[PDB]
Design a protein around this ligand. Structure first.
Ligand SMILES: *C[C@@H]1C(=O)C2CCN1CC2
Ligand SMILES: *C[C@@H]1C(=O)C2CCN1CC2
Ligand SMILES: *C[C@@H]1C(=O)C2CCN1CC2
Ligand SMILES: *C[C@@H]1C(=O)C2CCN1CC2
Ligand SMILES: *C[C@H]1C(=O)C2CCN1CC2
Ligand SMILES: *C[C@H]1C(=O)C2CCN1CC2
Ligand SMILES: *C[C@H]1C(=O)C2CCN1CC2
Ligand SMILES: *C[C@H]1C(=O)C2CCN1CC2
Ligand SMILES: [Zn+2]
Ligand SMILES: [Zn+2]
Ligand SMILES: [Zn+2]
Ligand SMILES: [Zn+2]
Lengths: 195, 195, 195, 195
DNA sequence: GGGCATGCCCGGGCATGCCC
DNA sequence: GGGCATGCCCGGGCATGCCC
């Protein structure tokens, strides 16, 4: 009956976790200490999917954004009106999160919660590789007036079988911004000094 | 053939000029040194109309915004998409400038230049008074993404007869902002120090 | 019989001349010493038209680009293939020079010389003003491979009556570039040191 | 479901690897330290194919370019518009990579990913020889505006049987430029000093 | 082979909505 | 009223086609 999706980490029976690749305006930078990706608008944000056991055929990978703070959790995360009026052919203009480089992407609007998500098939790593990578794009800055409006979000990645069973769930915070390197360095310093 | 309206001051045969009434977040404050009004979003911005000779019956007062900088002059000033989706009953949501407190306001979209304008009847001062005041409202901040986007505007006020003849023109710069007193003080200080 | 238009200054009986408004990446900067405008791609380049005597009704203003160097004069100046595949509604994509802010702009391809030009009506200055301003845009950098390719151009402005008589002609060099302030300062220094 | 081809080295059951032949503007020079070929536009770039075991009859050799950087991987590498408008009879003008000196070259456009590829038959070395050489040509510089636009590419070379099975994969970075010797020396020095 | 011109890149710093 | 976060701006400097 809740309209807020769970954010609880659940590595599950397949041992599912995420991984991230390792400069003031670098396109993206991940902070392990904050479990937080700092990236730029509409630029590639690679996310690695790691499993210990191979999921069954037909497994899907869903990404959804939610507001991190209790006061805003129940608000659906959407693109701002400006960037909505700004396409790749498939992503509805209201969706914040896109996937690039995938021929089987699906964009969903939940008919009960109104929340947006984007789904791609799970592909196992190629022989000799330990993970599979998805290229996400965030189509607004965290600061956009009328959209995220300086409020932090979480991206929730779920691994789901074809029947809809939850196989695994993970999440990370996102700050989309002009200067990821600056903003990560400042947040990490405030954490150490004042957190 | 130009689509940019004139901004040239023209006091005209009636001696037409503007006047302004005389704190970090005051609702509005006018800088004579900069010929610039600093005011808050959707709050009253009074402008006085002064004439030496009484205009003829059916005279009208039009207000229109243009970008001040040469690089932006040819672009129509519009409300940003966020505030457009935010009414008083008569103002189209795309118009930046509204008039409050007037039963005869007319909002115009130019069919050739696409520029917006707001018009009210000219009313002579009451006996013993030297001027007539119009309460304007600016419906975005100068900073709004997808709108003014930090670009300065001028408001051009024209006195026109019923036939459309230009009787007088004056203009002033406008900065719509959260903190008019701070922003005025900073710009005036930079003018004296570095202008 | 020549396919190269004249560039000879001809102030004519109306006393026609141009004027220019007076920072590393400023949008544009004019060098009187070089008679040369340094501006940015697709940004406003204002040019003032000055006359001593009022031209007759129906006078037009034409702008055309030609290569300045003898070795390239006979080559038609065009947009590069990249920027051609990049509109305002009226300018053909092959034209280098556009006019913004004018409801009566006309773009011409000469059927014999294949050269491009853009024409607007001449409007006399408003009462109290000494000149009329046209906002040109250059849609390629001087450096564009396959277009100007680092070769300098001249813009030729002609004042023509409705019948086609040449009333006046002027010209200026143009360098469209990323950093007008840098490039002007460097060229002026080399002129003084080595010219 | 991905539209980005794998770049993972796979020597495979046949022991497949590449080899390269060993001056500021030399036509080409290969850096083992960088696994990077530096070569000139439209000039021969020989690549050797080495195998430990003889591939089956009907084996084919495919070459394809992808952008090396994560941010650009999902974009198809194409010739820039200028050089596209510049042929050998068989290569489509949009293809960056050509093969010279082969009577059986095939140029392919993938109907799903839109990526370009060039394929020739695999020929075993002549008796006494240890490798077979293919002469590739790169038809734009890495710097070309509207094409690679200064972004590094990889060339992915795949050995495939007639049925389409992947037998082996190798790749190398390519920098197409005016001065291969200069650019190699500079990148190798920056690697040692700052890498 | 030595060197220039020029698009584009930063790391330093401003303006401004919003917070106390 | 005092102060932070954040998009965007520079002036300094690199990479690279082309010139001698
Ligand atoms: C997760 C894996 C790795 O460890 C490297 C980088 C991304 N994938 C493919 C190779
Ligand atoms: C212009 C006049 C005045 O001088 C005061 C203030 C505004 N109006 C009415 C009275
Ligand atoms: C040429 C004239 C002037 O002298 C100023 C600036 C541009 N026009 C209008 C006013
Ligand atoms: C790979 C072989 C060699 O070692 C030499 C040079 C190129 N091929 C033919 C002979
Ligand atoms: C931080 C951000 C900026 O402001 C520019 C330089 C570095 N980064 C990218 C653009
Ligand atoms: C400048 C502005 C603010 O930030 C608050 C205090 C004063 N003013 C109004 C609200
Ligand atoms: C010279 C040019 C640049 O390289 C950036 C800063 C100044 N100018 C505009 C952008
Ligand atoms: C680097 C390049 C040049 O600029 C010329 C000399 C050497 N090389 C070929 C042409
Ligand atoms: Zn946005
Ligand atoms: Zn707004
Ligand atoms: Zn161009
Ligand atoms: Zn090219």
């Amino acid at each position: 009956s809740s309209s807020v999706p769970s954010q609880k980490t659940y590595q599950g029976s397949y041992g599912f976790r995420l991984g991230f690749l390792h400069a003031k305006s670098v396109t993206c930078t991940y902070s392990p200490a904050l479990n937080k990706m700092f990236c730029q608008l509409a630029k590639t944000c690679p996310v690695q999917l790691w499993v210990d056991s191979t999921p069954p055929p037909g497994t899907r990978v869903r990404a959804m954004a939610i507001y991190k703070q209790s006061q805003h959790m129940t608000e659906v995360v959407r693109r701002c009106p400006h960037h909505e009026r700004c396409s790749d052919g498939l992503a509805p203009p209201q969706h914040l999160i896109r996937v690039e480089g995938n021929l089987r992407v699906e964009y969903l609007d939940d008919r009960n919660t109104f929340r947006h998500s984007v789904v791609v098939p799970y592909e196992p790593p190629e022989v000799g590789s330990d993970c599979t990578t998805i290229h996400y794009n965030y189509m607004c800055n965290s600061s956009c007036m009328g959209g995220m409006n300086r409020r932090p979000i979480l991206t929730i990645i779920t691994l789901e079988d074809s029947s809809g069973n939850l196989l695994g769930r993970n999440s990370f915070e996102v700050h989309v911004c002009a200067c990821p390197g600056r903003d990560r360095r400042t947040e990490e310093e405030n954490l150490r000094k004042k957190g």
